[PDB]
Amino acid sequence: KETAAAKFERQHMDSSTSAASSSNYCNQMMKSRNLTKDRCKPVNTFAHESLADVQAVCSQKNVACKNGQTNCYQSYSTMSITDCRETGSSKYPNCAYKTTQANKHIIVACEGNPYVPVHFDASV
Numbered sequence: 462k463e464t465a466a467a468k469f470e471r472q473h474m475d476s477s478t479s480a481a482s483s484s485n486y487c488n489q490m491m492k493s494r495n496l497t498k499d500r501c502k503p504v505n506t507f508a509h510e511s512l513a514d515v516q517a518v519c520s521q522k523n524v525a526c527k528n529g530q531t532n533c534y535q536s537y538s539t540m541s542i543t544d545c546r547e548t549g550s551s552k553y554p555n556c557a558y559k560t561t562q563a564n565k566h567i568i569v570a571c572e573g574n575p576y577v578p579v580h581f582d583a584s585v
């Protein structure tokens with residue numbers, strides 16, 4: 462079974478590029494990160510910062526999660542991220558995604574030792 466730390470890294474990390482280069486970024490990344498295997502994952506967000514910078518968020522501004530938990534952390538500075546969401550024509554096994562790139566603060570839930578991000582809550 463995939464660990465909660467590695468699951469976040471597979472779903473929400475993309476340090477290779479600075480930003481989403483094209484509209485086909487999500488269609489390629491959702492397939493490459495195995496998020497369209499048996500079901501097209503409706504909403505997923507990739508971060509375009511180094512692994513150390515996203516892991517550093519857990520020791521930053523402590524905020525409440527959307528569900529009610531107190532282990533979420535908002536980043537101090539705005540980070541380059543891309544939100545991938547299914548379009549109207551998206552239907553398995555032909556998953557289609559909308560690519561939207563913007564610079565925002567990231568909010569991530571952190572747990573364990575070392576204290577690393579496991580869930581991507583939202584972006585502000």
Ligand SMILES: [Cl-]
Pocket residue numbers: 464466467
């Ligand atoms: Cl791990």
Ligand SMILES: [Cl-]
Pocket residue numbers: 504505506581
């Ligand atoms: Cl997400």
Ligand SMILES: [Cl-]
Pocket residue numbers: 575577
């Ligand atoms: Cl680590």
Ligand SMILES: [Cl-]
Pocket residue numbers: 472579580581582
């Ligand atoms: Cl998540």
